[PDB]
Design a protein around this nucleic acid. Structure first.
Ligand SMILES: Nc1ccn([C@@H]2O[C@H](COP(=O)(O)OP(=O)(O)OP(=O)(O)O)[C@@H](O)[C@@H]2O)c(=O)n1
Ligand SMILES: Nc1ccn([C@@H]2O[C@H](COP(=O)(O)OP(=O)(O)OP(=O)(O)O)[C@@H](O)[C@@H]2O)c(=O)n1
Ligand SMILES: [Mg+2]
Ligand SMILES: [Mg+2]
Ligand SMILES: [Mg+2]
Ligand SMILES: [Zn+2]
Ligand SMILES: [Zn+2]
Lengths: 73, 186, 928, 188
RNA sequence: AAAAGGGUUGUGAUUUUAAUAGCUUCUUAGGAGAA
RNA sequence: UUCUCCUAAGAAGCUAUUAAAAUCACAAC
């Protein structure tokens, strides 16, 4: 059930970004919202995965906001 | 509601009345037994109702305190739960591009911008060490997010422009790592 | 050659090179629209004429142009009669040139009447093409638009070129016609001025006038003493009226010399009353319209005259500058300090209205006066800054703060445990029939202003006066069975007092605070105050955080406390009676459980013959709604009050409703804007007014469908008589014919049965009559919505069903199925499974994610799940069992948690009944 | 409660009945004493029940009075807040120009919409894109509402200050649109 | 975090109160029986 | 006069149902 997992992960990822005070930057928040809604509306999996890649790049760019090595372990 | 203090008297009075009616004893004795049964049963029901009230109050108290404590527990820890759930689902997805970017970020090779979706768009990446450069880069090409890119410019920590030829294992100590790389999508 | 000789005589003394259209001397065949009232037919309909020969004129380069010669062949007495009338009328410049000549057709002598330089199409053709919009009529509308340089032929290759919503540019295309329409109006008045002076009695109809404004067809007229002639113009103006606003003719009035090339008039900025200019416009354009017109509706005698004068006012107001249409302010003194306060309103609809209880000097402010002065926007707008907002086309008044506010919408929370349980059970696999479709969509900071800018769709609209005045009585027939009236403050019921009180009252508390602070005497004093004075109020816009299938934002309007209190006290007695009734057309307040759905469906099916079901949707319903229909709904609701309220009190109540709900000041992001019109979300009457508007639209569609049919082809004599009497009642009668209103109401209820709830409707209709054209269908709804609402109803959204055993395709988002229960068969509703699964998976608060507390939350979701078990699709059936098993698991986990924490088990086990099916089955059995 | 005198009479009857039962008196004496004791019991129960009724009535009346006092306090607080807001707004507005325009009016009435246009000293403009900025606000002074305005510094969507030198066609993608410009009214 | 959170109808669960209903208690009068 | 039995009124206690208030949650236009 890959596509439903991708959509649920998009919901969780945008919630994580929102809690991280991304809203303070209106431009970045608008881009994140567009990516989230586009993934939710998408119908075929590869487009959703590429948009997910961009949305996750948003979170990864924020150096020191999340301890990636601690979280993933 | 059982084994209450008045229960024994009620039970014994009913048994005595039943034995009396089974014997066919004197009517006045039967009526005396029945009235004693009735008064004992009245007391039994009264204390049973009191016990019911106590039980209801205890049940409500326990339920309310459970609700409040668990609501506080759920509300306090939201951020860590969200991050842990996100990364658990990300591992469960098992996608090559997501794993590639996540593992690169774990090694310190984070991007400086949103990774673009379209051809010839611009991406910027940080390179912590020559080993990660050896892994990620090959001549004029860069491999990132399962996609192929073309190197545009390499810079240093003091903003010095560095030529691609300079990056070598023997020459590496001269550079002030980390490096910044700019690339376009093929 | 005979044909060449006939053409040479037709040419006459003119220098017009003629082109022999048709064939020789033969009569030509054309399909054209006519307005007609005979002793045997009465209609506004398309006909095949076959009455005259036609020739075309060619330019000096021998290419064809829009200028025709038409010659009619008819009886000799008509020949002399028309010659006499035309000889009378010759002096007028609004009359087309006529010639009369005799010619050898059969070898004998035949008379002919010729008219010159006519356009291809008449005014009736344009009016019919716009009012009865469909693709077949689109083929004529395209030719009309192309011929008069509105647009080039390639324009029609665009997608949705006709759509007011997807292609707003179409509104620019129609405006080019408008000036050509205006010249038609003036000519008509000129013609009347001749006809009265000559001493002629005749009726005017649209078909006689060409698109240049010239007239013909004198045969109907009769003579009278000079200076005492009369024109009859009711049907002409009444049919023309919607086109006047659609094409925006009076825009030419805006300029100084009324030349479209001259600059605009620069009015005095402080001017607010235009009574003389309204009277001048009415006298110029509508000279011979024989009914008294009041520029200010306060003078009007009754609700019908209010509708009439407001219908004229809405057309006339477009000319005047936008800044004047607002509340009027005045300076007063209190305890020696100066206040600025409101004293009156200038309505685009209802004119200039003044308050009666003003105080120029006062010593103290009571609580009621403090509420009144804090509520109205005069102080906030006067103290605030000046605003110029380029994000919206709407007019903007002021900014209340140095900073504008951008409001976002957050995403929803994920209920991972239920998702994992569902995936373990086997849902959400690729290729499954059930999948996630409803989500919590996020929004950026621009959401609120964009959803406000959606209001731009609302446009001014002038309705067909006579048709509307008949339709309003037909609707009052639908509503008449209820009771209503005013009540004292102690009687009113409020559902929830922890709701917002609007702006600025929300700064200090919820509605409970104001309901506690004011005794019943203060509330009754305020309500009595509104019956004599207009109170403007501010409305706030909020963004709603809720699950949806579509990603566009949704905003809702909160209304100030004063308007809510007075509107509740006014309307609640009628609204509660509407909710209490069963078996009516308006189905508000009827539950779907315990057999209600079967009863509603059986009620709608009653006594129709050859039945079909159909339903439709209004696009952009609340934004697009014309002001006139909202006024009509308010007046229909006010009609119940006649027993207890005098006319002045009811007019002031209507003015209050207009000032607060219809065109109030809207607060968004800290800035004040003016709402152009349409429905608001917090009226305290919104659903019932929407139901009134829905019924009015359906009745108008039925009226158009019956009138458009060719009366010669109807076989049933009863329906022909009904059509004749319908035309008579609409256009050729003045006072209301109650008997025919009852007769038409009975006809509608017999053949066309409705079920109504806000903008959702189902109708069961007679398919044979619908195919013959005696009752409405989807096409008529499309045309009526196109010309009245200024929206195009996408036919794909509508639906129709032929088999009554399957029920309606959609009502209140429910699907219908037929099932066995005992030895009886019943109807049951079931929802979209995606909605139930999404409501399980996504929640709007973090605490809801924990299941044990939410056990009671899941039980309700199981109830809607119960009908899905009856479905023949297994994937649908599995959902209800999934919910039951999740409830069982939640109870087990709760027991374990409490046993671990407190070390004592629970002593009450009612929850055992929840995971077993029978309880849910009780919900739908009609037994109790 | 035991202090009730009816309870005391019942207690004397109770002592009499207990002594009679302990002594073993005849059934007829026990019956008469029982009916006396039950009369006393009926009196005691009746008085206790009416006492319960009186006490609960008193509690309800007291709760009503407490609720009324709280309502009066809330009313006073709301009145104070409303008066303060109204007088602050009275002090904020510019009396001179508003008095001039109101004195100019024919009847003393003026439309509300014209008051901010004529009297207001400060203007705010919200601009979504660079083309609109170039059209509406190019330069340090611009004319609107038949008046001349001079500019005060600008803020973006993040409410951070933007210098007027930054706003340019090439740089436009970097800014966080929309932009909010503020201005003051020139004296002339 | 701040801020803000509309109108109308239906449904479920929990607590409180009122009114009918059934039963127990024991006081009072009348009728009947026995001496 | 005294005992037993029945009927009727009052005062308490338990229980079944119906109807009104408050709190939480769900669904629709
Ligand atoms: N611009 C144009 C072009 C063509 N025509 C044609 O002229 C004829 C008009 O006939 P008429 O003698 O004026 O009227 P009538 O048929 O006696 O009247 P009725 O009983 O009201 O239908 C029709 O064939 C077309 O409508 C036109 O009028 N105007
Ligand atoms: N909280 C809510 C929610 C809804 N509504 C009502 O639902 C309706 C929503 O309109 P709709 O026909 O569903 O949608 P629309 O805007 O016409 O969209 P379109 O069909 O794409 O043109 C309105 O009558 C009210 O907005 C209300 O009252 N409160
Ligand atoms: Mg005609
Ligand atoms: Mg709709
Ligand atoms: Mg529908
Ligand atoms: Zn009037
Ligand atoms: Zn009334």
């Amino acid at each position: 059930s890959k596509m439903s997992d991708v959509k649920c992960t998009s919901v969780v990822l945008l919630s994580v970004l929102q809690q991280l005070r991304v809203e303070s930057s209106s431009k970045l928040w608008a881009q994140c919202v567009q990516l989230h809604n586009d993934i939710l509306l998408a119908k075929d999996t590869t487009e959703a995965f590429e948009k997910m890649v961009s949305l996750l790049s948003v979170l990864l760019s924020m150096q020191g906001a999340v301890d990636i090595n601690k979280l993933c372990e | 509601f059982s084994s209450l203090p008045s229960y024994a008297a009620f039970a014994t009075a009913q048994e005595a009345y039943e034995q009396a009616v089974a014997n066919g004893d004197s009517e006045v004795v039967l009526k005396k037994l029945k009235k004693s049964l009735n008064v004992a049963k009245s007391e039994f029901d009264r204390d049973a109702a009191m016990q019911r009230k106590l039980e209801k109050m205890a049940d409500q108290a326990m339920t309310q305190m459970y609700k409040q404590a668990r609501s506080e527990d759920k509300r306090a820890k939201v951020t860590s739960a969200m991050q842990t759930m996100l990364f658990t689902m990300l591992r469960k997805l098992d996608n090559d591009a997501l794993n590639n970017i996540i593992n690169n970020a774990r090694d310190g090779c984070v991007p400086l911008n949103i990774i673009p979706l379209t051809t010839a768009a611009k991406l910027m990446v940080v390179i912590p060490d020559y080993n990660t450069y050896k892994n990620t880069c090959d001549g004029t090409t860069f491999t990132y997010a399962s996609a192929l890119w073309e190197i545009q410019q390499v810079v240093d920590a003091d903003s010095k422009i560095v030529q691609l030829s300079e990056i070598s294992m023997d020459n590496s100590p001269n550079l002030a790592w980390p490096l910044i790389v700019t690339a376009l999508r093929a | 050659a005979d044909a060449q000789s006939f053409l040479n005589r037709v040419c006459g003394v003119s220098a017009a090179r003629l082109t022999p259209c048709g064939t020789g001397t033969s009569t030509d065949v054309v399909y054209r629209a006519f307005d007609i009232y005979n002793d045997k037919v009465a209609g506004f309909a398309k006909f095949l004429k076959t009455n005259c020969c036609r020739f075309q004129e060619k330019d000096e380069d021998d290419n064809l142009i829009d200028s025709y010669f038409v010659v009619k062949r008819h009886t000799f007495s008509n020949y002399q009669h028309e010659e006499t009338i035309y000889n009378l009328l010759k002096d007028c410049p609004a009359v087309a040139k006529h010639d009369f000549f005799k010619f050898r057709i059969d070898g004998d002598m035949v008379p002919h009447i010729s008219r010159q330089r006519l356009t291809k199409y008449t005014m009736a053709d344009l009016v019919y093409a716009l009012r009865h919009f469909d693709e077949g009529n689109c083929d004529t509308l395209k030719e009309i638009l192309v011929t008069y340089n509105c647009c080039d032929d390639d324009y029609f290759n665009k997608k949705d070129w006709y759509d007011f919503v997807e292609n707003p540019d179409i509104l620019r295309v129609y405006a080019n016609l408008g000036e050509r329409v205006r010249q038609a109006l003036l000519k008509t008045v000129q013609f009347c001025d001749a006809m009265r002076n000559a001493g002629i009695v005749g009726v005017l109809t649209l078909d006689n006038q060409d698109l240049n404004g010239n007239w013909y067809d004198f045969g109907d007229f009769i003579q009278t003493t000079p200076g005492s002639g009369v024109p009859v113009v009711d049907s002409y103006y009444s049919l023309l009226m919607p086109i006047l606003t659609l094409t925006r003719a009076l825009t030419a009035e805006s300029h100084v010399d009324t030349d479209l090339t001259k600059p605009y008039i620069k009015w005095d900025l402080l001017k607010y009353d235009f009574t003389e200019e309204r009277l001048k416009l009415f006298d110029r354009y509508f000279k011979y319209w024989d009914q008294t017109y009041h520029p200010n509706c306060v003078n009007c005698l009754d609700d019908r005259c209010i509708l009439h004068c407001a219908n004229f006012n809405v057309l006339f107001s477009t000319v005047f500058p936008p800044t004047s249409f607002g509340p009027l302010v005045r300076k007063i003194f209190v305890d020696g300090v100066p206040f600025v306060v409101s004293t009156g309103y200038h309505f685009r609809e209802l004119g200039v209205v003044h308050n009666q209880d003003v105080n120029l000097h006062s010593s103290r402010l009571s609580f009621k006066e403090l509420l009144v002065y804090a509520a109205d926007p005069a102080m906030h707008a006067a103290s605030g800054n000046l605003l110029l907002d380029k994000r919206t086309t709407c007019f903007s008044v002021a900014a209340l703060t140095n900073n504008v506010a951008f409001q976002t919408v957050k995403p929803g929370n994920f209920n991972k445990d239920f998702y994992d349980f569902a995936v373990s059970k086997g849902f959400f696999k690729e290729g499954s029939s059930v999948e996630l479709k409803h989500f919590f969509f996020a929004q950026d900071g621009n959401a609120a202003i964009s959803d406000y800018d959606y209001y731009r769709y609302n446009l001014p609209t002038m309705c067909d006066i006579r048709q509307l005045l008949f339709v309003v009585e037909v609707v009052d027939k639908y509503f008449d069975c209820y009771d209503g009236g005013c009540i004292n403050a102690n009687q009113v019921i409020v559902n929830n007092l922890d709701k917002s009180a609007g702006f600025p009252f929300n700064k200090w508390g919820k509605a409970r605070l104001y309901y506690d602070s004011m005794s019943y005497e203060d509330q009754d004093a305020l309500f009595a105050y509104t019956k004599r004075n207009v109170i403007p109020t501010i409305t706030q816009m909020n963004l709603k955080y809720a699950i949806s299938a579509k990603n566009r934002a949704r905003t809702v309007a909160g209304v100030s406390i004063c308007s809510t209190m007075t509107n509740r006290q006014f309307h609640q007695k009628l609204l509660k009676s509407i909710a209490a009734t069963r078996g009516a057309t308006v189905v508000i307040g009827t539950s779907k459980f315990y057999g209600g759905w079967h009863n509603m469906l059986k009620t709608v099916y009653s006594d129709v013959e050859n039945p079909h079901l159909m339903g439709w949707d209004y696009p952009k319903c609340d934004r697009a709604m014309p002001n006139m229909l909202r006024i009509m709904a308010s007046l229909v609701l006010a009609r119940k009050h006649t027993t207890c309220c005098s006319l002045s009190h009811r007019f002031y109540r209507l003015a209050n409703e207009c000032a607060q709900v219809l065109s109030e000041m809207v607060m968004c992001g800290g800035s004040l804007y003016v709402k152009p019109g349409g429905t608001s979300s917090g009226d305290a009457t919104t659903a019932y007014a929407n139901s009134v508007f829905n019924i009015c639209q359906a009745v108008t569609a039925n009226v158009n469908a019956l009138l458009s049919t060719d009366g010669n082809k109807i076989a049933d004599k009863y329906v022909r008589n009904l059509q004749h009497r319908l035309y008579e009642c609409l256009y050729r009668n003045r006072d209301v014919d109650t008997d025919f209103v009852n007769e038409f109401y009975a006809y509608l209820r017999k053949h066309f049965s409705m079920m109504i709830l806000s903008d959702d409707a189902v109708v069961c209709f007679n398919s044979t009559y619908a195919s013959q054209g005696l009752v409405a269908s989807i096409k008529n709804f499309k045309s009526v919505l196109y010309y009245q609402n200024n929206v195009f109803m996408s036919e794909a959204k509508c639906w129709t069903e032929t088999d009554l055993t399957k029920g309606p395709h959609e009502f209140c988002s429910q699907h219908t199925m037929l099932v066995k229960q005992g030895d009886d068969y019943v109807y049951l509703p079931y929802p979209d499974p995606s909605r139930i699964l999404g409501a399980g998976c996504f929640v709007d608060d973090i605490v809801k994610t924990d299941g044990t507390l939410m056990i009671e939350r899941f039980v309700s979701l199981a109830i809607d799940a119960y009908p899905l078990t009856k479905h023949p699709n297994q994937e649908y059936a599995d959902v209800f069992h999934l919910y039951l098993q999740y409830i069982r698991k939640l109870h087990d986990e709760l027991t374990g948690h409490m046993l671990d924490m407190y070390s004592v088990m629970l002593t009450n086990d009612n929850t055992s009944r929840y995971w077993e099916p029978e309880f849910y089955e009780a919900m739908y059995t009609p037994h109790t």
